[PDB]
UniProtKB/Swiss-Prot annotation:
Assembly description: Interacts with EPHA3 (phosphorylated); dephosphorylates EPHA3 and may regulate its trafficking and function. Interacts with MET. Interacts with NCK1.
Cysteine persulfide found at: 211
UniProt-recorded name of the protein: Tyrosine-protein phosphatase non-receptor type 1
Topology of the protein relative to the lipid bilayer: Peripheral membrane protein
Residue numbers of the full-length protein present here: 5 to 282 of 435
Gene coding for it: PTPN1
Active site: 211 (phosphocysteine intermediate)
Length: 278
């Protein structure tokens, strides 16, 4: 209903306007520190100090990442920017330390003729990556390339202790160049694929999600997921408010969903995913 009304009245941009206005604003002192300038992909996308993920290194614990703890749904996520040439080792340190199982990439390394992220994982299993700085090794065990996404089974080994962990890499490869996806079918089907793996389950650390800044599409993933999970617990889609859930997540990281266009899509995905869920 609400979705249909906003569409009829065309008030999407307005709706999004007010959400941006209602959004929480918190400090990002650490991020802004000069010694961290090169640890950030974008000027306008920073992790709030209260929720940033700290690296377990006595050196510099900065990594542009935020933990989003959704108490009600009982689900956490770690939103992050695509790792930079100089931060792929930090990215993996974080993954290891936070005991993450899955990694969700919602972007292509190159979109619109520009490199939106680093090739932080191996492409050929016969050539593994070793992150000197964080003393971690990464190996491609397998990958399944499909029409709209690719799953990769990587193995992350802590070179310090020789411990080995199986990380799953869910790569959404079909998000449009401009605009949002014409239909939620693939996104939801991708979400579901992420869910099935146990990557989102409580028995693991929070899933690391990222696009370029890790807020637009990453935000969409998390919003669709949480709302759907909430509609399950209460089993009442009538109480699950997309806008209220979004604002709740925005207390943890800025810019989740960056265009009213995307907002409408989150409504589409949630509404469409509720069909199976309900």
């Amino acid at each position: 209903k609400e979705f249909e009304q906003i569409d009829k009245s065309g008030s999407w941009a307005a709706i999004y306007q007010d959400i941006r206005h209602e959004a929480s604003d918190f400090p990002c002192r650490v991020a802004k520190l000069p010694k961290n300038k090169n640890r950030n992909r974008y000027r306008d996308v920073s992790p709030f100090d209260h929720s940033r993920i700290k690296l377990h290194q006595e050196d510099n614990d900065y990594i542009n990442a935020s933990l989003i703890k959704m108490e009600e749904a009982q689900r956490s996520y770690i939103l992050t920017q695509g790792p930079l040439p100089n931060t792929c080792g930090h990215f993996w340190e974080m993954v290891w330390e936070q005991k993450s199982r899955g990694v969700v990439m919602l972007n292509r390394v190159m979109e619109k003729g520009s490199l939106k992220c680093a090739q932080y994982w191996p492409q050929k299993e016969e050539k593994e990556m070793i992150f000197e700085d964080t003393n971690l090794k990464l190996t491609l065990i397998s990958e399944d390339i499909k029409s709209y996404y690719t799953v990769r089974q990587l193995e992350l080994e802590n070179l310090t202790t020789q411990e080995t962990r199986e990380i799953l890499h869910f790569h959404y490869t079909t998000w449009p160049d401009f605009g949002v996806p014409e239909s939620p079918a693939s996104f939801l089907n991708f979400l579901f694929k992420v869910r099935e793996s146990g990557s989102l389950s409580p028995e693991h650390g929070p899933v690391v999600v990222h696009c370029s800044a890790g807020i637009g599409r990453s935000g969409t993933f998390c919003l669709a997921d949480t709302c759907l999970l909430l509609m399950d617990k209460r089993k009442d889609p009538s109480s699950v408010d997309i806008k209220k859930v979004l604002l709740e997540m925005r207390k943890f990281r800025m810019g989740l969903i960056q265009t009213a266009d995307q907002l409408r899509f989150s409504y589409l995905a949630v509404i469409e995913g509720a069909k199976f869920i309900m």
